[PDB]
Amino acid sequence: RLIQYHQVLEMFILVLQQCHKENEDKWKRLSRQIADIILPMLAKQQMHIDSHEALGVLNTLFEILAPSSLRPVDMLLRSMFVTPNTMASVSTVQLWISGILAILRVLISQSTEDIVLSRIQELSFSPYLISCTVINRLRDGDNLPEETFSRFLLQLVGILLEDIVTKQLKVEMSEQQHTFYCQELGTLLMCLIHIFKSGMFRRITAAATRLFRSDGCGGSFYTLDSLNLRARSMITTHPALVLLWCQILLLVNHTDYRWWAEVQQTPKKLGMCNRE
Amino acid sequence: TKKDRVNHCLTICENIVAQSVRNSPEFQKLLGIAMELFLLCSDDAESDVRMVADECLNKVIKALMDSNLPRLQLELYKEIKKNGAPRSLRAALWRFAELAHLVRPQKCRPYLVNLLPCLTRTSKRPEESVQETLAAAVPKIMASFGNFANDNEIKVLLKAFIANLKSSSPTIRRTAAGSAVSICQHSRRTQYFYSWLLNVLLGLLVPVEDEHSTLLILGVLLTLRYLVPLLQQVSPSAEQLVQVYELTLHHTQHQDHNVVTGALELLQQLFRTPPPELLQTLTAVGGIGQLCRIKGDIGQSTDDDSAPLVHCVRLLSASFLLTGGKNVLVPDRDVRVSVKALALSCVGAAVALHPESFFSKLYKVPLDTTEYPEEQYVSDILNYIDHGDPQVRGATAILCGTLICSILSRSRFHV
Incomplete structure (x- = not known):
């Protein structure tokens, strides 16, 4: 009855560890009982996971649940591939992205590219779930499977970049909410670097490399140049996140000097430390 | 003449703290006549008798907080209930407000309903010094008893202070402005009561073109200035x-x-x-x-x-x-x-x-x-x-x- 609060997920970690040290078939049943409740709640933004403490406790619960309780990945996929009720507030966007980060971490640590992509092909998701059209509605109020998965993650990079560089630190968001936007973007770009650098996700890497060369498909999707405009505006405020974006550009072979000559300040007042 | 009233107030103080047995024999009579004597010494004509009487209330209170505190609060309440001479009322009211956080939960609902008639009756008092003691007392009383009120109690106490926002005295206006906002702040339904007080305060000025008094404008703008700090997180x-x-x-x-x-x-x-x-x-x-x-x-x-x-x-x-x-x-x-x-x-x-x-x-x-x-x-x-x-x-x-x-x-x- 209280499972939306991360202090109760700490108690489920305790309860699950104890049944895993006696009845292994109580551990499986309780793991199904918890997972069949939490995945619908992540899909509806009903979990209180808008902090690094709460997101870290939810990540830990997914390591402690019995692997069979998550094994047909369809309920993870049907919980991840969803829109929020709105994007007009900061809180709803953060509850939505936090729930995606939790499930993305399960897919890349407890499943495989073959299992995930073959289920994404069968379940009939599409790239257009969070097109710029959908995003623009929800900000006012209300295919190959690797192409769907890659486009979904790269649309989230756009949403986080637009919010980090356009919201204001007393009007629209608090310093704690601004901190968690940066911690979510940092977590997303580390997931993308793991996916591209590990060699375990070769079809998603090929698809993402093809997407970064694509146009916006009639303005359905963020162009690489629109993402780079936002990232260039962060050089003065968030150098650590911009260096993760530089690392992503190299993993997809974007070696265009129109980016690299700006960040490296290539030759054609004390200066700013974040630029250095 | 003068020294006799001093030595009498001081010798009863010494005897109250010296008794030591405290098993409610004659000591319940002695403490009552001591508290009433000090609250008379505290409105005596001669300055040294008043200066002594303050030490004797303060000494007896701190000497008996460990044991007879429910009786100290009751004898202070009796003097507030009298509505007597200004310094006798003040000398009871500020001390009662200092002791209010020490009341046990079972006695809060009783003390509140006994003090709503008092806080409304003393808001109608014309003395600027009784009003500066009331401005200090209401936040302390309501921080302890406000959860034991209900909406009809709270609205009676708000209307009593809102009637003073018209007053010529800046001090009466200040006491009313601070009291009303503290009464909202320590209610059960704080967000409701902020919006309710906003509707009354705007109700006093909404037409804008009408011939509103300078005094009422000063009282309402002051009440809004104390309220605004509480509205930043029914509601406003x-x-x-x-x-x-x-x-x-x-x-x-x-x-x-x-x-x-x-x-x-x-x-x-x-x-x-x-x-x-x-x-x-x-x-x-x-x-x-x-x-x-x-x-x-x-x-x-x-x-x-x-x-x-x-x-x-x-x-x-x-x-x-x-x-x-x-x-x-x-x-x-x-x-x-x-x-x-x-x-x-x-x-x-x-x-x-x-x-x-x-x-x-x-x-x-x-x-x-x-x-x-x-x-x-x-x-x-x-x-x-x-x-x-x-x-x-x-x-x-x-x-x-x-x-x-x-x-x-x-x-x-x-x-």
């Missing part, structure tokens, strides 16, 4: 807070400098601690429309072309700081240095929310070119850094600090 609405803002701007144009000062102080609180929906409204383009003379067109708060803080910074600058003549400064005979220092502090707070409002021309439509050869910017208010008054000069330095910080953060260092 955006439009209900827009009314407070529009009203606050209107009273900056009153003929009485007391009303101008009270309006500028309310405006300073609004920009230092804005409620979220009000912040959104005042920084949004067309935000309100989506729901010592001015000398030209400065726009209106309702204009579609701009954010409301742009009109606000023009209105303050045109009313108090600038004449329309480039690099010339309003005389200190025309506008007081106190009103000037407040106007500079309001502009510095508006520029913290929306720094584009600093860069504006003072008028939307230019003045007569034959009288005014060149146009004036709001940024001429930096000339007050050379003004003779240290507070005006210091307020102008805080405007420089707030402008630099606001522009650097709004631009994300893309200056």
Whole structure:
């Protein structure tokens, strides 16, 4: 009855560890009982996971649940591939992205590219779930499977970049909410670097490399140049996140000097430390 | 004659603390006659008898907090119930309020219903000194007993203090303004009671064109200024807070400098601690429309072309700081240095929310070119850094600090 609060997920970690040290078939049943409740709640933004403490406790619960309780990945996929009720507030966007980060971490640590992509092909998701059209509605109020998965993650990079560089630190968001936007973007770009650098996700890497060369498909999707405009505006405020974006550009072979000559300040007042 | 009343009050004090047995024999009689004697010694004609009696109440209270405290609070309540001479009532009321957090939960509902008749009856008291003790007492009593009230109790006590917002005494007005807000703050239903008090306080001024008394305007603007710090996180609405803002701007144009000062102080609180929906409204383009003379067109708060803080910074600058003549400064005979220092502090707070409002021309439509050869910017208010008054000069330095910080953060260092 209280499972939306991360202090109760700490108690489920305790309860699950104890049944895993006696009845292994109580551990499986309780793991199904918890997972069949939490995945619908992540899909509806009903979990209180808008902090690094709460997101870290939810990540830990997914390591402690019995692997069979998550094994047909369809309920993870049907919980991840969803829109929020709105994007007009900061809180709803953060509850939505936090729930995606939790499930993305399960897919890349407890499943495989073959299992995930073959289920994404069968379940009939599409790239257009969070097109710029959908995003623009929800900000006012209300295919190959690797192409769907890659486009979904790269649309989230756009949403986080637009919010980090356009919201204001007393009007629209608090310093704690601004901190968690940066911690979510940092977590997303580390997931993308793991996916591209590990060699375990070769079809998603090929698809993402093809997407970064694509146009916006009639303005359905963020162009690489629109993402780079936002990232260039962060050089003065968030150098650590911009260096993760530089690392992503190299993993997809974007070696265009129109980016690299700006960040490296290539030759054609004390200066700013974040630029250095 | 004189020393006898001193030695009597002191010898009963010594005996009360010396008794040591305290098993409720005759000591319950002795402590009663001691407490009533000290509350008479504390309104005696001779200053040394009063100065002694205060030590004897304080000594007996601290000597008996461990054991007989329920009786101390009851004997203090009896003197508040008498409604007697001013110092005898004060001497009971502040001590009762110090001891109020020590009441056990089972006795709070009893003490509250016994004190609603008292706090209302003593609000009707004309003495300025009884009112300064009441201003200190209500926050302390309500922080302990307010959860044991119900809405009909709270509204009776709010209406008793709201009736004093009309008073000629600034002290009676201050006691009423602080009491009403503390009564909301310590209620069960705080958000309901803030919105209810906003509806009464706006109810006293809404028509705006009507012949409202200067005294009532001063009492209501003061009550809003204590309330605003509590509204930043049924509850207060955006439009209900827009009314407070529009009203606050209107009273900056009153003929009485007391009303101008009270309006500028309310405006300073609004920009230092804005409620979220009000912040959104005042920084949004067309935000309100989506729901010592001015000398030209400065726009209106309702204009579609701009954010409301742009009109606000023009209105303050045109009313108090600038004449329309480039690099010339309003005389200190025309506008007081106190009103000037407040106007500079309001502009510095508006520029913290929306720094584009600093860069504006003072008028939307230019003045007569034959009288005014060149146009004036709001940024001429930096000339007050050379003004003779240290507070005006210091307020102008805080405007420089707030402008630099606001522009650097709004631009994300893309200056």
